[PDB]
């Protein structure tokens, strides 16, 4: 594991939205990993639990792509990037950023999006 | 505490280490805050470690920039910056991604500054 693999699972993991691949972004992380993801809510536990959180992140097709560059050090990893969808005519676009702890074997152990409503960029 | 003070907490950051502020920056913090900042390297603890270690980041002038938006949710905020300086005619800029956790009385517990090599740009 270093900086280069890190910033590698970043880019998997964005194309991985942009493609709607679950499979994708599920073998990214620990079979222990926890994600949580929209305010300092309750983190999700199980391989299935996070399955089950990116199946609902992608109802609507996601525009992913990253903003700046990856900061990767340690075995940590942070990301600026947004998140566009489209709704009834409206776009939307969600501007987080994430944190990446990895294991030892490489694999996301766990992820946290941060973002508040300052960060949700839509019109009427 | 709210987004909008998180928010101008780094703000008032931000201007603190360009003015070279000591005393502004170091109030942002808990009396027992924490602050990591170069790697996954070992954490100063003290309000007296904290200025120790600001005081170090200062020898030479920064020039430090936001450079998108703050995310502010829950008791965190997370920021993209630049710091920039000069050195024996060199210019440097390093693009960390910073991670603030807040008290209940609006200070900062917690700093981790996450950057590695690649974060670093600087000619010869
Ligand atoms: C989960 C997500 C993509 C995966 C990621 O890593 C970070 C985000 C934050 C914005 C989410 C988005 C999924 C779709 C969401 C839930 C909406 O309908 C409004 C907020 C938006
Ligand atoms: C500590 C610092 C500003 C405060 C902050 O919040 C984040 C950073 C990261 C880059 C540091 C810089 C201080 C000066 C440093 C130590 C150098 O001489 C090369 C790396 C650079």
Do not use: C
């Not at 620990?30 to 992608?58: C, H, K, M, Q």
């Not at 600026?80 to 969808?85: E, L, N, R």
């Not at 990446?100 to 694999?107: I, Q, S, T, Y």
Request: glycine share 8%; charged share 20%.
């Amino acid at each position: 594991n270093t900086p280069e693999h890190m910033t590698a699972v970043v880019q998997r993991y964005v194309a991985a939205l942009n493609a709607g691949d679950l499979d994708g972004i599920v073998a990214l992380f620990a079979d222990d990993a926890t994600v949580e993801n929209g305010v300092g809510s309750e983190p999700r536990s199980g391989t299935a639990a996070i399955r089950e959180f990116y199946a609902n992140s992608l109802k609507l097709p996601l525009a992913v792509e990253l903003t700046q560059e990856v900061r990767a050090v340690a075995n940590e990893a942070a990301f600026a990037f947004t998140v566009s969808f489209e709704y009834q005519g409206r776009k939307t676009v969600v501007a987080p950023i994430n944190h990446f702890r990895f294991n030892g074997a490489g694999k996301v152990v766990s992820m946290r999006a941060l973002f508040g409503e300052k960060n949700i960029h839509a019109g009427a």
